[PDB]
Amino acid sequence: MDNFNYKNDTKIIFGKDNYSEIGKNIKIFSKKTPKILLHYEADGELIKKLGIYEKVISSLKEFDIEFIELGGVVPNPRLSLVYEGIKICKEENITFILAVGGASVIDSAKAISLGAVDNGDVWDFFTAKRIPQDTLGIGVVLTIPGAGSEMSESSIITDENKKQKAVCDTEVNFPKFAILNPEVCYTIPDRLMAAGIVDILSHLMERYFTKSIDTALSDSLIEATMKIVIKYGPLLMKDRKNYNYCSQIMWAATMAHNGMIACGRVADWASHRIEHEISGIYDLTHGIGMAIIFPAWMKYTKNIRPQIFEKFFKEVFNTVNIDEGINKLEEFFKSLGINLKLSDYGITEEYFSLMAEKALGNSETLGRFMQLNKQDIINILNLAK
Amino acid sequence: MDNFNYKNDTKIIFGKDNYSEIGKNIKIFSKKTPKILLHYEADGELIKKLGIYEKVISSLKEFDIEFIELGGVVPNPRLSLVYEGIKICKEENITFILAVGGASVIDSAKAISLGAVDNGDVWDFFTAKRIPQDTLGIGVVLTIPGAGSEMSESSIITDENKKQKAVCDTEVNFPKFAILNPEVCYTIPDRLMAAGIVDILSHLMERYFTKSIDTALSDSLIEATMKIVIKYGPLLMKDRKNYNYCSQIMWAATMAHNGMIACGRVADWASHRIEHEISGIYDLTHGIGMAIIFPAWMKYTKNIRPQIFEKFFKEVFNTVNIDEGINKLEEFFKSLGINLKLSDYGITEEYFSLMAEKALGNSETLGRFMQLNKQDIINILNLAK
């Protein structure tokens, strides 16, 4: 019964053996004669080794696109490099940016696209001083499936001088196009691919367990997507170069980041916030943490709205029994290679209380589906210990 | 394994008690000071009686939007009226068009938005002479759920002087925004509401029965949507002012017209083409016809890819038995009030052969999932007689 609005203008170009689409789509979206800035991480090493670089260069030649290269993106993209990109755009009369890589290259490209067309300081857009109203325009070649910035309206940039991270969220940030080829999955190492599967399922699950009502169709779409991740994830884990398996998983990621299927329901970020503190202290991959934390949060919140738990486990795991369902969900994680206890990762109870306080910050509780105070979070951590 | 591209830039505004969104979204999308053309069918009778008109006028006042009204839209929108709208736009310096109504008002508005910004003849865009490259911009208040032109890139206009219907399909035709309120369903008469439910399910079904492979996730999304139509349609038919029921059905229509869930699969238009000829000769509502024709086509094509039929009936009707499944599908139609035989509608076999020839036109077969020659179509009509 919750009203909602939905919009996503990013053109999705899904599939393989279609590298000509790069220059074709640059022409569709660049203003007059294309002259583009090629943006990537470090000096190309990864994308060059994977053969993506030579493929991009050949699509640019095949359409007579003049291009300048700006490398140097760092996993947490720096305003230092953004500022440099604005200059190169203004001086060299760049018409369009092509981000080749992942969330760091994409977000760097988004902030360069913002400043290139602006007569002030781009950090005003990130620090709530000004509201951007235009962007040069970017396209993305996605190399590693992640949080979906290739179709989001958010850019996250860190100012290393003040050591301050800021976000700019606005419609103009939507990439004009996003090339998605499942083949980029083939080379991701097993552990990180298992983690990324958990991230897709975590992202849907956080929207599913909701106190919103009248979401029958939304429920079914989210169930259908979660079920695919549960069925195909283990198959992909054992057959890494299977195109069908990678397509299903990467289209499920897309469908999860898109939110047409999640429209009209309130998400809960408790497990994400608790996991964040584990990762902030220990070297734990996000997906590995969510596989550990989410079953524990499910057990602790099983009494809030038991019927929505019964529906989830009936629709996704064909069982109305919550405890058997939870065990099935835990077996599914173990089938991707992930150990389920924090102690398995050498994490002891030592910092549970500190983790809970950090997650809580200046509030007494965290969560929406269930409000969690300090001891509640410690109890969830003990369930996962 | 089929590559695909997807894009839809129309902003969806879903829900009720949100008529302020009309003028708010006009301001977001109109170029500088808004001055809009209010477009509708006839002289407003329907939308005025429903109370939609007074609601639009009050949202325009609440945001100081100056507006001119152009009525006169006819169920098959006429270039006559389009041309008139281009003039009013150019003379009166209109910045934005607000279509209040259904597919006819929307398509008329789309062609006026095209010509208002062009220095030539708009019919060049419909007659393959020129490719439109801009539009003034329109927003839609949808009054009757239908084929989804409120989020399509197509406009269908008839030139009554040459009696020629033409279509212009292009990205600029996408409405800037589309207000969708389930409450507009409450007043639709029973027969037409049953037909419209069948149309949503027909639209998904035509994309589902495909010889494309590697569509596991797409299958599941389409199943989930079809299942909702099967479950909630009968409930809505018996509880016409239930907001939850109308929301599920109208969001399923949206999800069906959007095609993110159908991406990467080939549709079959055989039943649509056969039904078209029945409607061309008899006074038969499209949805009523598809409820009669689609089970007959299913029976006739049951041997092409029986496994995809087994999956459809298992996932949507919980049965692996095709014949029992088909009967369940036929019972579902009868539960919306629809009789299933052509003879029930006084349609005899008299024009079966003529209908088949018209549907075939200059080709020997029709269909993709199964190629159907003349006698095949007569056999399908006899199954439905």
Ligand SMILES: [Co+2]
């Ligand atoms: Co998360």
Ligand SMILES: [Co+2]
């Ligand atoms: Co149809």
